[PDB]
Amino acid sequence: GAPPIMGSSVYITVELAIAVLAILGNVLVCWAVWLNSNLQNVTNYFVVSLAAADILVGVLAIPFAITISTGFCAACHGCLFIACFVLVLAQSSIFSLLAIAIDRYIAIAIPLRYNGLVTGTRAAGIIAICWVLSFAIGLTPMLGWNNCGQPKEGKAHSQGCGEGQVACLFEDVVPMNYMVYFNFFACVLVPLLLMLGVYLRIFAAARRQLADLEDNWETLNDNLKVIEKADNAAQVKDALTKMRAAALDAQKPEMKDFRHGFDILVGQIDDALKLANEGKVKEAQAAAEQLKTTRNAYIQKYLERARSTLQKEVHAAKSAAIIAGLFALCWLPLHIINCFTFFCPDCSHAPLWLMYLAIVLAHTNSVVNPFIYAYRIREFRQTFRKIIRS
Ligand SMILES: CC(C)CCC[C@@H](C)[C@H]1CC[C@H]2[C@@H]3CC=C4C[C@@H](O)CC[C@]4(C)[C@H]3CC[C@]12C
Ligand SMILES: CC(C)CCC[C@@H](C)[C@H]1CC[C@H]2[C@@H]3CC=C4C[C@@H](O)CC[C@]4(C)[C@H]3CC[C@]12C
Ligand SMILES: CC(C)CCC[C@@H](C)[C@H]1CC[C@H]2[C@@H]3CC=C4C[C@@H](O)CC[C@]4(C)[C@H]3CC[C@]12C
Ligand SMILES: CC(C)CCC[C@@H](C)[C@H]1CC[C@H]2[C@@H]3CC=C4C[C@@H](O)CC[C@]4(C)[C@H]3CC[C@]12C
Ligand SMILES: CCCCCCCC/C=C/CCCCCCCC(=O)OC[C@H](O)CO
Ligand SMILES: CCCCCCCC/C=C\CCCCCCCC(=O)OC[C@H](O)CO
Ligand SMILES: Nc1nc(NCCc2ccc(O)cc2)nc2nc(-c3ccco3)nn12
Ligand SMILES: CCCCCCCC/C=C/CCCCCCCC(=O)O
Ligand SMILES: CCCCCCCC/C=C/CCCCCCCC(=O)O
Ligand SMILES: CCCCCCCC/C=C/CCCCCCCC(=O)O
Ligand SMILES: CCCCCCCC/C=C/CCCCCCCC(=O)O
Ligand SMILES: CCCCCCCC/C=C\CCCCCCCC(=O)O
Ligand SMILES: CCCCCCCC/C=C\CCCCCCCC(=O)O
Ligand SMILES: CCCCCCCC/C=C\CCCCCCCC(=O)O
Ligand SMILES: CCCCCCCC/C=C\CCCCCCCC(=O)O
Ligand SMILES: CCCCCCCC/C=C\CCCCCCCC(=O)O
Ligand SMILES: CCCCCCCC/C=C\CCCCCCCC(=O)O
Ligand SMILES: CCCCCCCC/C=C\CCCCCCCC(=O)O
Ligand SMILES: CCCCCCCC/C=C\CCCCCCCC(=O)O
Ligand SMILES: CCCCCCCC/C=C\CCCCCCCC(=O)O
Ligand code: NA
């Protein structure tokens, strides 16, 4: 039995290293949003709430985790607070991650009502509400779902604890049925699966909208060819009728030129339709050839801009999804071990070294988001560079 202070020293040193890095990187995130107005939008207010949770992992939850690893004598309800506060921060992170996903879904599904629906003022009230809910969920053991009524009195006496005190150890005070059914299944797993469903909807909506843009374009170019090889006024008329509906369909500084572009296009379709309906096939076909000028000078530019805007939303949603996936990857090992402890009382408990490895992996999640923003989001990377240089 090696002196406990040796493995303790390794664990604590690693925790302190993670705390340092979590504070530094997430303070940098908050400083970038505060300073750069191109980063001040509703999405990034949830990003800052998430960075605040991660700063508090470094400032409070890691010092608390170091403390509870010692099994020090404590009043049981004080022990519960330092065991459960990290659950508040994890719960807050979950709400922020779900909000980021929903925000991006609203942006890609209804971009015309996004700015009217999702405002800074409503985001700050959602954030406040979510922090209150996170305290209620993470500190639910303090409302009475705890093991303080059944203290491990032999362990308390062996350590010389005083009356009313327990050896402060996570699995002695926090019930495992709370950890598995309430904290993990209800409060973590279900929101993460909801997030997964929202991201699937985002990527499907993007794929569908890019397919629609390409379809409208091909319909435009195919019907031009229909008109070119029609042999009567009625065929020209039918192809132009369709083109007119599609152009109006697609019509739903750069905005002035693209509105001007579609105005010309509808006007030119209308000129060609009138000629067709007068039975003037050749005149109608020549009028339709003028549509190629508008297609080259305006419609193609609209198509390329619309595509590039959707491709940026896909890239941005992938970045946010990577962050949600990394939260799941860093926290799942600990939840899964708790499931074994709880559901398999005939299995030997996960060994101590694995418990602490899973705890430090969960804490490491508070380090990683600044790196994802730096690597995947030019505007953050550039603001980070400017802050670090100045
Ligand atoms: C806003 C921030 C800076 C304040 C942080 C206050 C923290 C450190 C305080 C608030 C409540 C305190 C706990 C309340 C009661 C107990 C039980 C006692 O037997 C041992 C200490 C212990 C477990 C305290 C540890 C320190 C503690 C967690
Ligand atoms: C989220 C991804 C990375 C999956 C991680 C899976 C990890 C957490 C799984 C894979 C194999 C698992 C171990 C398999 C066997 C045992 C022996 C049993 O007596 C205690 C639980 C314990 C020690 C399990 C702990 C959880 C475990 C380590
Ligand atoms: C989408 C995925 C990641 C959801 C997470 C799946 C979790 C809930 C699954 C993955 C592996 C599962 C464990 C695999 C094996 C055992 C040992 C058995 O004696 C009791 C149940 C128990 C302990 C399972 C509990 C639930 C479990 C931890
Ligand atoms: C990508 C890198 C950082 C992952 C690091 C994984 C390391 C830290 C993990 C993987 C295997 C683990 C070891 C596996 C077995 C034991 C034996 C045990 O009696 C003491 C702890 C010890 C020695 C573990 C310490 C932590 C450990 C070394
Ligand atoms: C964003 C990237 C992730 C951030 C990562 C933050 C820091 C984590 C590194 C820790 C290694 C520290 C050295 C650990 C060496 C210990 C080896 C050892 O001897 O283990 C003893 C054993 O555990 C006794 O039981
Ligand atoms: C023995 C003790 C039992 C205790 C059981 C506790 C139940 C938790 C309930 C409320 C905590 C509220 C905490 C305050 C949350 C602050 C929210 C906030 O500051 O949000 C900022 C906002 O973003 C600005 O725009
Ligand atoms: N099971 C558990 N244990 C601990 N710490 C104690 C590790 C341990 C477990 C058993 C033992 O005999 C001695 C120590 N922290 C823990 N944190 C969590 C957690 C937080 C969020 C999800 O799970 N679970 N968890
Ligand atoms: C896509 C779905 C993702 C996962 C959702 C469902 C998770 C359900 C997990 C259930 C594990 C229940 C384990 C019960 C073990 C009983 C042990 C015993 O009876 O001795
Ligand atoms: C993503 C899901 C992956 C699932 C992996 C396979 C899980 C099925 C394994 C069940 C293992 C059951 C082992 C229980 C052993 C102890 C039984 C006992 O003595 O009570
Ligand atoms: C996706 C992960 C898949 C990993 C491999 C899955 C295989 C898991 C196998 C579990 C076998 C458990 C055997 C337990 C024997 C116990 C003896 C007994 O209880 O009588
Ligand atoms: C992503 C899901 C991965 C979850 C882990 C999958 C591996 C599941 C294997 C479990 C094996 C449990 C072995 C039982 C050990 C004790 C046997 C006994 O005492 O009866
Ligand atoms: C994944 C991030 C890097 C992880 C490196 C892991 C090394 C440190 C973590 C665990 C080592 C095990 C030491 C635990 C000793 C028991 C703790 C205690 O009882 O005080
Ligand atoms: C860029 C570097 C910034 C500062 C990095 C600091 C990294 C080291 C952090 C913590 C190490 C503390 C070591 C204390 C050992 C105590 C173990 C014990 O008390 O038993
Ligand atoms: C000094 C005592 C108070 C400590 C409270 C710490 C809470 C977490 C720290 C910072 C989170 C709030 C930072 C928000 C600043 C940026 C806001 C914005 O980007 O518009
Ligand atoms: C335990 C003592 C400290 C506990 C602090 C917990 C409360 C955290 C409160 C605020 C951090 C959230 C900051 C969110 C800023 C986003 C709002 C916005 O940008 O408009
Ligand atoms: C806060 C996020 C939203 C919460 C939604 C919760 C919906 C409920 C989902 C999962 C709860 C899991 C219930 C498992 C019950 C088994 C209990 C038992 O048999 O002892
Ligand atoms: C959707 C995420 C998880 C699904 C929500 C519901 C939770 C999983 C479904 C059933 C789990 C029930 C586990 C309890 C079985 C008996 C427990 C026991 O005997 O100890
Ligand atoms: C499109 C590639 C351009 C390369 C530079 C990147 C510019 C910005 C790109 C995407 C913005 C990503 C926004 C994702 C929201 C993150 C929210 C979160 O999950 O925390
Ligand atoms: C419990 C685990 C759930 C974790 C949720 C993590 C967030 C989901 C992340 C990615 C899912 C989306 C995968 C589909 C990719 C399509 C991309 C594309 O069309 O270009
Ligand atoms: C990112 C990597 C994801 C990998 C998920 C799966 C990891 C677990 C895989 C194998 C572990 C299986 C251990 C089975 C132990 C059986 C012990 C026994 O029989 O008692
Ligand atoms: Na977090």
Author numbering: -1 to 208, 1001 to 1042, 1056 to 1106, 219 to 305
Sentences from the paper on this structure:
Hydrogen bonds are shown as dotted lines and the 1.0 σ contoured 2mFo-dFc and 3.5 σ contoured mFo-dFc ligand omit electron density maps corresponding to ZM241385 from the soaking experiment are represented as blue and green meshes respectively, carved around the ligand.
Here, we report an in meso crystal soaking method developed to improve the crystallographic throughput for our work with the adenosine A2A receptor (A2AR), including drug discovery activities. Previously, each ligand complex structure required a separate, bespoke A2AR-ligand protein preparation. Now a single protein preparation can yield high resolution structural data for A2AR in complex with up to a dozen different ligands. We have demonstrated that an in meso ligand soaking methology can rapidly and efficiently yield multiple high-resolution co-crystal structures from a diverse set of ligands in complex with a given GPCR.
